[PDB]
Every structure is written in C-alpha cells, then in structure tokens.
Amino acid sequence: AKRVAIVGAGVSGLASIKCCLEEGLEPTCFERSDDLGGLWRFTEHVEEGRASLYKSVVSNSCKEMSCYSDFPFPEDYPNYVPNSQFLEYLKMYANRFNLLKHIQFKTKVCSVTKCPDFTVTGQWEVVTQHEGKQESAIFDAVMVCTGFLTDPYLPLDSFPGINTFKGQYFHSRQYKHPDIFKDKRVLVVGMGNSGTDIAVEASHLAKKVFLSTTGGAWVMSRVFDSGYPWDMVFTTRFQNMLRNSLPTPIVTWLMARKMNSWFNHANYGLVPEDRTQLREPVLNDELPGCIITGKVLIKPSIKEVKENSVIFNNTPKEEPIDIIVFATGYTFAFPFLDESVVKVENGQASLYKYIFPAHLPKPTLAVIGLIKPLGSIIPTGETQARWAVRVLKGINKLPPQSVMIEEVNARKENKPSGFGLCYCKALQSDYITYIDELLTYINAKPNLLSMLLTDPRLALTIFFGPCTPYQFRLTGPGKWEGARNAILTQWDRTFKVTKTRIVQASLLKLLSLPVLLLALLLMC
Numbered sequence: 001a002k003r004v005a006i007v008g009a010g011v012s013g014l015a016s017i018k019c020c021l022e023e024g025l026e027p028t029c030f031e032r033s034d035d036l037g038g039l040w041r042f043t044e045h046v047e048e049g050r051a052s053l054y055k056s057v058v059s060n061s062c063k064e065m066s067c068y069s070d071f072p073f074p075e076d077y078p079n080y081v082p083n084s085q086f087l088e089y090l091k092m093y094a095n096r097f098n099l100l101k102h103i104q105f106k107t108k109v110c111s112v113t114k115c116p117d118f119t120v121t122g123q124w125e126v127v128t129q130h131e132g133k134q135e136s137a138i139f140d141a142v143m144v145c146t147g148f149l150t151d152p153y154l155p156l157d158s159f160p161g162i163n164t165f166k167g168q169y170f171h172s173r174q175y176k177h178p179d180i181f182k183d184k185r186v187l188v189v190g191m192g193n194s195g196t197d198i199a200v201e202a203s204h205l206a207k208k209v210f211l212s213t214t215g216g217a218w219v220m221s222r223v224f225d226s227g228y229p230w231d232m233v234f235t236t237r238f239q240n241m242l243r244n245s246l247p248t249p250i251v252t253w254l255m256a257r258k259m260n261s262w263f264n265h266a267n268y269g270l271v272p273e274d275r276t277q278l279r280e281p282v283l284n285d286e287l288p289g290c291i292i293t294g295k296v297l298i299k300p301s302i303k304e305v306k307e308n309s310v311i312f313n314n315t316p317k318e319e320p321i322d323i324i325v326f327a328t329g330y331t332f333a334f335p336f337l338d339e340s341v342v343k344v345e346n347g348q349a350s351l352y353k354y355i356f357p358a359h360l361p362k363p364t365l366a367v368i369g370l371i372k373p374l375g376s377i378i379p380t381g382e383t384q385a386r387w388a389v390r391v392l393k394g395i396n397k398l399p400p401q402s403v404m405i406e407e408v409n410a411r412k413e414n415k416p417s418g419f420g421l422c423y424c425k426a427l428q429s430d431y432i433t434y435i436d437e438l439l440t441y442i443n444a445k446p447n448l449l450s451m452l453l454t455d456p457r458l459a460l461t462i463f464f465g466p467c468t469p470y471q472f473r474l475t476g477p478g479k480w481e482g483a484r485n486a487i488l489t490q491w492d493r494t495f496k497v498t499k500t501r502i503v504q505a506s507l508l509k510l511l512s513l514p515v516l517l518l519a520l521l522l523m524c
C-alpha cells in the first residue's frame, strides 16, 4: 500500500519501479529529461543533470552478465551492446513490466525533505518542477536513482598554464563525435575507460594523438580468453572464491602476469608505477594496435601546457597540440537531499550497504546505484532495489543505528585487510559478495551445497560457470521460472551472435592459467 517516490528513470530508476510493482507498492518516478535510460539514451546535445555519452560507446560488461536478473538480452544482441541497443533493451524492460505508466517526464526533483512529523510517519515532501511549475507532494518513502557520472571533474589547478592554451579543450562529457579532430594534434588527458576510448577513436582521423596517463593502468580486451567475454571468465563464483581466499601480494602479482600475457605493459609505457593498489583496469581492444602503429602514444603526465603546446614530466620533447580532451572522470552530488540526510564526503555518501543513510529513525530513504562494483551496475542496482523496497515495506529490517554507523566507519577508513584483491577506496565493492550479502537478507541466496545433491548440473554451472544475474532469481521472493533454463543456455546465446558462419556449456576456463597448475600439491 506504501507510496514510493523514485528520483530518475535510469537503469537504477526502472529497477526500483519494477521492484516496487513486484512487492506491491505504489511507485511514482520523477525523470527530469523527456525519456528514460539517462546515460544509455544517447542524445546529440549535452542535457544538464543527466550523464552524457559519445556516439561510439558499447557496453564494457558483457550481454549475459549485465542484464536484469529476470530479463535477459535478446538472443540476436551482440555480446557487448552499443548504447543504441542498450537503450532499446531498457525500453523493453520498461514496456514488459508495465513501468512506463508510473514515470513523469520533464520533472526535476527540486527537493526531498523529511515531513515535520517524520519521526513517527517516516514520510517525505518531494518538490517537483514541471513546465516551470513547482508542486509539493507527500510520499511514504523515496528511492533516489540519480547515479553519478553527470557532474564533470576538471581540476585545472592540476594542469599549470592551461589558461594560456590558445587551442580548444574540454571534458570527456562534452565529447560526442570524432569529426572535430580531423587532422588535429590531440592530447587525451587521463587513461579513464572514456579517455582511452576517445584517444583510440581520435587516432582514426587525427594527425597525432597522445594519451597522457598519471599512474598508468592495466589494459585488457573484451575478447579475452578464447573469444569469451572477459567477465564470463573472470566474474565467476569459483574464481571470486580463489582471489578473495588468497593474499593480496600474490593475486596482484598473479594479475600482472595475466594482463602482460597480452602485451608487455612495461614496453608500451602503461605499467602502473604503484603495484599492490590495482585501480580499475581499462577495457579497450584497439589501444595496443594503436601504440605499436604509433597512431596513439602514451605520455607520462602534463608538466605544463604552453600557448599552442604541452610539456610532459620526464619528457624532453615539447609536443605541439591543437585539442586537449580531459577524460578526468566525474564527481557526484544530491542537490535535492539536505546534508542532514546524505553527506557526499570524499566520493562517498556514508550509507549502510551504499543505500540507507543509517541514522534516520525510519528507514524510508534508499539510494540505488551509488556503488562501484567488480561487475555490472544493471544487476547490482536491481539486486540493491530488491532488498531496498522490502525494507521500505518492512518485510526486511535494518540492524540498530549503533551497528550500521560503526560498520560503515570500518569501510569508510578504507582499511585494506590484505588477502582478497584489496577493494580500493570510494564505493569499492566485490560483485559476488555484495550480491550474496543482499540475496541472503531477502532469502534468495541459493544453497549451493544442497543444490549439488538435488540438482548437480545447475549447482556446478552456478559455481564454476559465469555468475550470471539469472542465478539470483533462482529461489526466494521474486523467483523466476525460466531462470534455470536461462543459466544452462548461457553460452548457446553467447555464441549464436559471433558464430554467423557454421563449419563442418563452457563451465570453467583459463583465468587461473599459471595458478591451478602452479598451486597443485608437491606430494612429499
């Protein structure tokens, strides 16, 4: 019966609407733009308050791995979907589960404030502008799905004399089409996934392209092992077990091996200076091809930028530059929340399970999609929303404010705790762990041990095979029937789209390639 306000109709938004309908609540979803998707909807223009995309973007997480747990991608969809097709997939999810009804478009959420009675009612005043007409309205609970990656980050201090530059420059955000660097001399600043992608793209046309890193980065292909989507090999329960039950110094060294096995990162000048602190690995299939053919060349860091030129640290050659692209990442904020509710300190909101603000008397505000997992946002946001709406409904319950506030402070001090691939800093989180924590909380986590006795086929395909989101809706509330069939047909769909030419499962694979061989008994 509870009335839920959903802020934004992005991936996270749609999941909330769906998860609301599903647990029989009344969702009202306020989108500020004129259609759903947020990011995944490519427009020509940059809309403010709404994440922006370049025309060439394709998913850096694979098809059967980054779909809503109860809604696979079509069979005819490529293993890594372009922004065009990703949007269609979202408009399909929206159509299917009848979500379009509940969305009000061109509706900025100007403010969400506790009701005066909140301490007893647990309600919210949601002020919403539409055709320049403010309109207050009371809601029983609010789910915020603004995500991040809309607010650009561009620290001009950090690039001395960029003011003096007489060429043109801009943030990745403002980038749409590669025409603009036809024959120009291009410097892409920051080896962000966006950076690398643009640099590579520029190389197609531009006379010269330089990609200025700072730390450097590890770089891997979508293609990965045997033409298998990397994630369908890497993000599997079994592997995730190995990594997490194995000392940081090893796994990090062990990764460098599996990253260099493509190309010696040292020779290409990508090698991160600081090992043992593995930043998000870059996902680009072209880069090396560009470096070896000299269409893109990695440069160490901007030392200073001149009238019509740039100088890099430890780099004697001053390089003439026409265009500078700052792929320097994005910040995030909540203008409609007050500081009393959500903090936004050090790229982090201080939320219990990166959702609930963990001091509020009543748990009736949820933040969906403010997390940086080791896997796709799509299922995380959804699996987030499942455990969320059931707190708002009161079917599940948060532990005491005393337990949440102190547990949050443990993750907030970014304490490495060694062993498992140290989870960086801000919104750090293992994909499988965080999902299993939440599936537990709503009693959807399948009993794998039991599974093995009852159904052994499925049991193994879930542990050794790719941790596909289907295996979330296998048992518990929201259980999907097709789930089992979907999990076992996993690879059949993954190969139908690549195998466009005939000739005359794929359980585990070769991630732990010099590992399972190296760490097998020395029987004395």
Ligand SMILES: Cc1cc2nc3c(=O)[nH]c(=O)nc-3n(C[C@H](O)[C@H](O)[C@H](O)COP(=O)(O)OP(=O)(O)OC[C@H]3O[C@@H](n4cnc5c(N)ncnc54)[C@H](O)[C@@H]3O)c2cc1C
Residues within 6 Å of the ligand: 007, 008, 009, 010, 011, 012, 013, 030, 031, 032, 033, 035, 036, 037, 038, 039, 040, 049, 050, 051, 052, 053, 057, 058, 059, 060, 061, 066, 107, 108, 109, 110, 145, 146, 147, 148, 149, 150, 194, 336, 368, 369, 375, 376, 377, 378
């Ligand atoms: C180039 C690129 C590629 C990516 N590829 C992948 C990928 O392959 N796989 C993956 O899992 N993730 C990927 N991501 C991450 C991406 O953030 C998610 O995939 C997805 O876009 C999450 O959507 P969201 O709901 O969190 O937020 P968004 O997509 O940003 O949607 C937020 C929505 O909220 C609306 N809004 C904002 N403020 C207000 C307000 N005050 N009132 C009302 N509405 C408001 C906006 O208009 C927008 O529609 C990628 C990101 C980028 C930039």
Ligand SMILES: NC(=O)c1ccc[n+]([C@@H]2O[C@H](COP(=O)([O-])OP(=O)(O)OC[C@H]3O[C@@H](n4cnc5c(N)ncnc54)[C@H](OP(=O)(O)O)[C@@H]3O)[C@@H](O)[C@H]2O)c1
Residues within 6 Å of the ligand: 057, 058, 059, 060, 155, 158, 172, 189, 190, 191, 192, 193, 194, 195, 197, 212, 213, 214, 215, 216, 217, 280, 283, 284, 327, 328, 329, 330
């Ligand atoms: N499909 C794709 O391939 C694709 C494309 C774009 C975006 N994405 C998604 O979007 C997310 C974030 O996108 P993004 O790449 O724009 O952000 P990002 O990955 O955070 O990139 C920002 C980069 O800018 C550099 N940087 C940051 N602060 C700096 C400073 N003060 N001075 C100099 N350099 C600085 C860093 O690289 P250096 O350390 O190298 O300088 C950093 O990695 C990704 O994780 C991914 O999910 C995916």
Ligand SMILES: CCCCCCCCCCCCO[C@@H]1O[C@H](CO)[C@@H](O[C@H]2O[C@H](CO)[C@@H](O)[C@H](O)[C@H]2O)[C@H](O)[C@H]1O
Residues within 6 Å of the ligand: 237, 238, 240, 241, 244, 245, 246, 419, 436, 448
């Ligand atoms: C195979 C050798 C394992 C050596 C383990 C010794 C190192 C311990 C360091 C801390 C890491 C945690 O260690 C780990 O805990 C639990 C056991 O309760 C198991 O973890 C498991 O949890 C759930 C079941 O509840 C599974 O869905 C998940 O896929 C799996 O990771 C791992 O098999 C074990 O390795």
Ligand SMILES: [Cl-]
Residues within 6 Å of the ligand: 174, 175, 176, 177, 178, 180
């Ligand atoms: Cl452009």
